[PDB]
Amino acid sequence: LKVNKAVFPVAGLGTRFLPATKASPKEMLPVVDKPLIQYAVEEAIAAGITEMIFVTGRSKRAIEDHFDKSYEVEAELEARGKAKLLELVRSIKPSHVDCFYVRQPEALGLGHAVLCAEKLVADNPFAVILADDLLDGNPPVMKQMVDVFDHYHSSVIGVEEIPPSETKSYGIVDGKEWEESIVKMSAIVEKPAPEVAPSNLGVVGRYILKPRIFEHLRALKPELQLTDAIQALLADEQVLAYKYQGTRYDCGSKLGYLKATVEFALRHPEVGTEFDAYLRTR
């Protein structure tokens, strides 16, 4: 079928970014002027997805109040005649894009986050997007992945070439290269030591999963590992790794967040020129 839904886990404690994450999830942190989770939702929108499922934890209000309509904000901008800013605010949740909220349960982890969205996805393929992985691509990365899914009708795992010495930080895939950017997966291994990693292809926070994933998630013994469920799924049906075109900023790390701020600011139409001149002369 069609990928109409995207699941966004936004329940991260963000202990790496305390004190800023005291009362706001790490996915609400702004890059220049826009929360990480909004970049991620905009990427899903560009891929044709119109149902956004947020799996919240503590500080759910920061996420909810960002995407839900504010009567007051729109009235203030309309009163001041600030028509561009008014369209900017409305475009946070465009018409015919729906936002639904579900709560992460006591048990933590990406696998549990996907499982608590099961009844909202039902028997449909769905995207999973981790907003801490800020991706810059044209076309947007999830749009590339939906095109691959629309062709092969198989689950799609976004991957990138990583340094071989860093495999202990990644899920690592193995398989037969089909086309240049497509791998028919034969295995996925969580955080192997470099000397036994089967490839240099590391999993990033972008998935398109078919609904058979849920039976494998429910069967796994417990934190729950999405990697184990994907490994079990590929015994029953094809799963593809897709080497996307684009640039990733790892905003789960403080340094990656700072790199994203610098690079996105430089391409910002209102401040890029002056920020570049400041960087040259500091």
Domain ranges of the chain: 1-282
DSSP H or E stretch at residue 206: strand 201-209
| Helix or strand holding residue 241 (H, E) | strand 239-243
Residues forming beta bridges with residue 207, ordered by sequence position: 128, 157
Asked whether the CA dihedral 265, 271, 272, 278 is positive or negative, the reply is negative
201: phi then psi, degrees, rounded to nearest 5:
-105, 110
Of 150, 149, 37, the residue nearest 99 (C-alpha)? 37
Cα angle 172-134-3, degrees, rounded to a multiple of 5: 75
Domain 1-282 has CATH 3.40.50.300: no
CA angle 159, 161, 163 (to 5 degrees): 130
Torsional class of 32: left (φ above 0), alpha (ψ -120 to 50), beta (otherwise): left
Which token pair is 6?
Answer: 């995207």
Instruction: Give Cα separations from 44 to 8, 35, 37, 123, 267 (angstroms).
Output: 10, 15, 11, 19, 21
Q: DSSP labels for 86-139? A: HHHHHTTS-TT-EEEEEE--SS-SHHHHHHHTHHHH-SS-EEEE-TTEEEE-SS
**For 51, what's the count of Cα atoms within 13 Å in the CB-facing half-sphere?**
16
Q: CB under 8 Å to 129, separation ≥6 — which residues?
A: 6, 7, 8, 40, 43, 44, 142, 205, 206, 207
Experimental method: X-ray
Determine the straight-line distance between the first and last CA of the chain, rounded to whole angstroms: 53
- Count of beta carbons in the 10 Å neighbourhood of residue 282: 5
Measured between alpha carbons, how far is 60 from 10 in angstroms, rounded to an integer?
9
| Binding annotation | 9, 11-12, 14-16, 26-27, 109
Return the closest-CA partner of residue 33 out of 252, 249, 265. 265
Which DSSP string corresponds to 45-95?
Answer: HHTT--EEEEEEBTBHHHHHHHHS--HHHHHHHHHTT-HHHHHHHHTTS-T
Is 268 exposed, middle or buried, given 0-12, 13-18 or 19+ CB atoms closer than 10 A?
middle
- Structure token digits, residue 38: 């909004």
Positions at the binding site for UTP: 9, 11-12, 14-16, 26-27, 109
Helix (H, G, I), strand (E, B) or coil at 42: helix
Under a CB-based contact definition with an 8 Å cutoff, are residues 242 and 9 in contact?
A: no
204: enclosing H helix or E strand: strand 201-209
Give dist(CA 94, CA 36) in Å, integer. 17
Radius of gyration of the chain (CA): 19
Residue 187 contacts by C-beta under 8 Å, 6 or more apart in sequence? 173, 174, 175, 198, 231, 234
Type of residue found at 133:
D
φ and ψ of 194, to 5 deg: -50, -40
Return the H-helix or E-strand segment holding 6: strand 5-10
Give the residue from 179, 229, 221, 222 showing the smallest Cα distance to 203: 229
Placement of tokens 């198989």 in the chain: 154
